[model samples]
Every structure is written in C-alpha cells, then in structure tokens.
Target: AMSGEAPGIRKEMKDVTTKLGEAAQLSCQIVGRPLPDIKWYRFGKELIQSRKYKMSSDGRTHTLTVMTEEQEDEGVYTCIATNEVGEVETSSKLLLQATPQFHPGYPLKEKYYGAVGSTLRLHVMYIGRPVPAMTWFHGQKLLQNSENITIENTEHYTHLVMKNVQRKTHAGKYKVQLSNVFGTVDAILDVEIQDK
Candidate 1:
C-alpha cells in the first residue's frame, strides 16, 4: 500500500501584508509520517536560529516571525517539513508595503502666466502603493524650499508656491517628479512672464 502518504502539508503558506517598520509572520501546518523536521525560509533563503526569526509551533501550527518588516522583506516564505521517509512543505507570503507607489493623480495645468508680484502655485496630486519620493524642478534644476519658494507635500499631492512671482527669476517652465521602485513619473507646467 501507500503506507499513508509522504510527509505532506496540511496548510501551505499563504500571503502576508505589513506596513513599514512592523513585524510579520508566516505560518505552516504540516501533516506527515516519521515526524517531519521543519525549517523556515524567505525567498528560498533559510531562516537561521536568530532573534529576528523563530519557529513557533503547536502540532499542526508552525510559524515564523519577521522581527522588523522592511520593503525588501516582502516575498514568498516557505516551511520545509521533511523526514527520512519523505518530505512535505508549505509556502506563505510576507508583503511589506513600504509606502505609496509612483503614479500621478492627474495632469497639472499645462501652462500659466501671471502678473508680476502675483502669487503663483504649482500643484500636483498623485497616488501610489507607497507614497513616492517627489521632487520639483525649474529650468531643469532641482527646486528646494526657500523663503520665496516653498514646497509642500502630502501623501497624494505636492504643491510648489512662488510667492509674489517675479519675471526675473520666478518665470519659466516647472516640473515635478515622483519616484519609487516601480520607476518615475513627471508632470510639467510652463510659467511665463505676463503683465510685465
């Protein structure tokens, strides 16, 4: 006969999700003969006997904990339970959402021209899985917060304020870019002198 079956998994690993700086866990429920030995792995790399990870089991329940979840820590996790007779295993997932992704909410107005001494603002609204690292540019140069130029950002939007727009230095093309592991997205706006 089959002598039952080779060591097999009762519950293979499932998927997991965690926010940045949090901990995560992967579980494995195995069933087998000859009392299979258990080991945990992340993306095929076996977990060691360390504080960051450990085996928590109760008969059918075998789990691993990720002490501190990071962006690179998201992936498929597995537990290999084997014995001399044969072996069984299970797999789970650790999804670490670092922040937002890299995407735009919409296009900014393509062009703008304002009267001298008038306040002007460039706005961008966007959405990503994990908020992205955004930058504002003018004349193809990076723009930083200054007394006359200010930058503000929220999870889904960015704003650049040019207080009292001046034709000499505040008028020109402007750009804002959002970036993450996925890549980058940029929005452009033209600022020209008007009512000069």
Candidate 2:
C-alpha cells in the first residue's frame, strides 16, 4: 500500500494590481497524495463563491476571481490546501489602481437645450487619484476664459458660463477630457440654442 504525502504547492500565487471595476484573478497549483481540499481567504476572513468573488478548481489548478467595486477590495489574499497529512498556504497582495472618471452622481448629458441671448452654464463632475487634468472643447476649437465667456473649476467640478449666447457660435458639440497617469476619460455633449 502507498502512503499519503503532505499537501504541497506546485505553483505560488503572485501579486496583482489592476484598475478598479476590473476583474482580478489569482491562481495556483497544489499536489497531494490523498488529494487536498482548497480554500481561499482575504486578509484573515474566509471567502465563498458569490456574485462578487468566484472560486473554481480544475484538476490541480485552483482559481479565485474578484470583481472589484472599490478601494476596500484591495488586500492580501491567501490560498490554502489541506489533506490528512498536512496543510500548505500561499498568499499574494491585490491592489486597485487609480484612473480618471466621470463622477457617478453628476454625469454629462448627451444633449442640452438653451435660449439665445440668455446666460448658459455647463458643468461636469469628475474624480480621480492625484487629481485629474480637465480640458474643454467646443467643436474643433479649444475653449478659454474671455469676455462674455467664463470658465471656472473647483475641487469637484468645472463650469463654463457664457453670457449673451449666440446660436451660430454657441450651438454645437462640446467635449470634456479628463486625464491622469493611469488613463483618460471623455464626455461629449450637444447644445441647441434657440431664439426667443
């Protein structure tokens, strides 16, 4: 009769760094004479298969998939294998990366209606790590602060206010670009100006 061997790790889990809202996968291979049972954990808490985290096993390979929602999801994750003889564990860190994005609470609408000769205000909310750089454009022309045209930016939003708006020049497509070290996000809006 053959004797059972202690649980052993044939492959180790490696650290993962990915953007928020993106899927993160961790996998490893384990070997044991008596066949080892596998379990996954985040920090010290055990994990179960659900909508946010998925667990699967294929022969000797075990995989854990995470659908990250926020920065709180980042942490150390461990994979443990156990048998009648012994137990083995491997751990890796999961990191969430930052990128520019439109704030979910206040997003740009695709179309806007305005009245000519009346003051028109346009603004967009944004969020990102290290702060995002913002640029506004009116069709092919870059927008700037000028008489009858004012551009303002605060910690959370940007405003473009126009006085005595004219249809020929003010009624068109407007685009805002937000960028940071990780990547860029853009929003386009159409403005329709009507005479009273």
Candidate 3:
C-alpha cells in the first residue's frame, strides 16, 4: 500500500514532566508514504498496552500515556518508527516532582503563647521523596543559629528551639519553610510572651 518511502520523524517526542503519582504523556509526529509501524520503549525495554501504559496513534501523530507515575517510572521514553524503506526513532526524558506531607500527631501550631521564663519549642514532621532545603523565620527576618535559638533537622523532622523568653524581641509570628526545585511548603506559629 506504500510507494516504499522511508520513514521519517517530522517532530521528535517531547519530554513529559509531572508531579508524582500523576498521569503523563509523550507524543511525536511522523511521516512515511506507506504509513510506518510505530513502537515504544522505556529505558531500552519495549512497552505494551496495560494499566500503566496506553498507546494511541492517528498514523501521523503518535502518543503514549502513563496512567500513574511513581519514582521508579522516571526515565527516557523512546519511539521507533519503521517502514519498508527504513527505520527512524526519537526519545523523550521524564522528570517527576515530589511534595511533602506532614504527619498528624503533635501538629505544628499557627497560634501559640508562652509566659516569661518559659521555653518555646516548635516542630514539624514531614515526608518528602527527597529531603528539602529548610529555613526558619521570625516575622520577616531569617533566623540565624545562635546559643539562645537553635534549628535542627533530624531526617524527617525539623525543630526550632527558643529558650528563656522574657522581653520584647521573642514575641512574634514564626515561620518554617521547605523548598526544592519543584516548589515550596511552609508552616506558621504565633508566639507571645509576658511583657509586663
């Protein structure tokens, strides 16, 4: 049914980027006189239609959909186009973003108060596929590590410890923020101490 025209990739597949545990797709455009047979591969292994992988084409624009993406699902997706004349191929890489979720017990507070001579301890316990960069803030000022104030990261938990709260400087809203290349997340705590 073809004139023996060689298969050619008019447009290569574009990379698929998505958040973790989400659906994604990679697509490309191809042209051939006899209409080439298209195939897909992931990390050098052939791919077939299943719950995780779905294939579709209009004999020109071809697409592959991944139903749900996990950490292990990250890799390159390649397309092979072939005709009686020859074969042509292309590839697209995948990048997935991870987010953090806090554990329910001993939840961080947005509003809190303490009396003079009392110690204030604020903590947040969270989980992210890759540990994120952290920052602690007092109002709009970035907190610096000092003897009176301490910040610590213990694997999945982050802590801000302030001791001997007395006068004017220690009473304000505090914020703890976490970030990675993908995005940012934060929690807030309001602190008040006896001034009079």
Candidate 4:
C-alpha cells in the first residue's frame, strides 16, 4: 500500500556541542509513507550499534548517541533515510569545547618580588580549545602597551612586561581573565617592588 509520498526529512538536526569525554545526541524528524529505514554515518563511515554508539527511533523522530572522548569523535554526522520510493539524508556538525585553564608545569606564582627601576616580566601559559581571549589588569586599571608596560597574547600563552618598575605604580596586584566559548578562568598575582 504505497501512496504518493517519498522519504524525506521533516525536522533537521542542528549542530551539537559537547565537552570532552561527554556524550552527544543528534536527532531529526523524518516523514515517509512506508516508514523509511534510518541509518547513521560519520565522515562517510557507517556506525553500528555498540556500547559507545546507539540509535533509537520514536514515531517520526530518529536519534543517534555518540560517546565523544577524542578529537576523532568530533565531525559531521549524517542521517540517511531510505524507502522503496526514494532516499533522503541530512547532516549535523559536532563541536568539542574546553574551558580555559593553566597548562601543566607552567603554574603561576602567588607573589613575585622585583627591584625598582628594573624590568619585571611575568609569564602565563594556558590551554583551551579554540584558544581564548584575555583581559589583563594592573590593580584596577586595564593593562595595555604603554611607555613602561607591554602585554603580549598568543593562542596558548601570555607575557606581561613592565619596564623601569616603580614602587607605587608597579607594586600591586596583577590579574588576568581568560575566556572562550566554553567558559572563563581568572588568576591573580601580587607584585612587591623594593628600592634598588
């Protein structure tokens, strides 16, 4: 009893975002006259029922669950529905997001001492997926390049340099905020300047 309907997608899946070692689910609604068969694939590789992967269907909605633990688990996933009349497919991207944190073995000190009129250099190494943007502060003032201060930022590190340190101006709290799509982390360091 075949009507004039072809297998096609009704509701499409959206991009899925998950943290490392977490599970992600991709779902969509499909329509067909004879109840099409649904299959899931990732990066052209067919996925089967396993402990790390599962598939389920309820009414017209189909879902695929993937346990993500490595970079290889993140990519475009395709859902194909086929019937005797026709075939249809849809895809969704999976992204992994990680919060910003200090890199191992490069921990920041709670306090540092510098001599007046000397250059003080501070280094902070951080790691996060998709990198991170930083906001630095010297006490309550936002930090930037100036006659006596220079701030450098990279994908995985930060360097703050203050030349000709002064007892009143450079001897204070130094703070930094690192943020990405996932989350934010803040750290503080106190600086003490002594007369040379």
- In lDDT terms, which candidate is top? 4
Clash count per candidate? 12, 0, 0, 0
Candidate 4: segments with Cα more than 4 A from true spot: 2-4, 101-127, 131-196
Query: Compared with the true structure, what per-residue lDDT tens digits does model 1 show for residues 48-78?
Result: 8677776787656788888753455666777
Model 3: colliding residue pairs: none
Task: Extract clashing residue pairs from model 2.
Answer: none
Span of ten consecutive residues with least summed lDDT in model 4: 1-10
Q: How many backbone clashes does candidate 2 have?
A: 0
Error of 3 at 193 (Å): 36
State in Å the error of residue 89, model 1.
2.8
lDDT per residue (tens digit) for residues 59-102 in model 2: 47888999988656777889999888888999998877778788
All models: lDDT?
A: 0.72, 0.83, 0.79, 0.84
lDDT of 2 at 160: 83
Residues forming the 10-long window of minimal summed lDDT in candidate 1: 98-107
As for TM-score, the candidate ahead, 2 or 3, is 3
Candidate 3 local lDDT, 49-156, one digit each (tens): 897888888989898888654466777889898888888999987766677556456576677777788777877886544567888898899998898888887646
Model 1, residue 19: displacement in angstroms?
Answer: 1.8
RMSD of candidate 2 to the truth, in angstroms, is 8.9
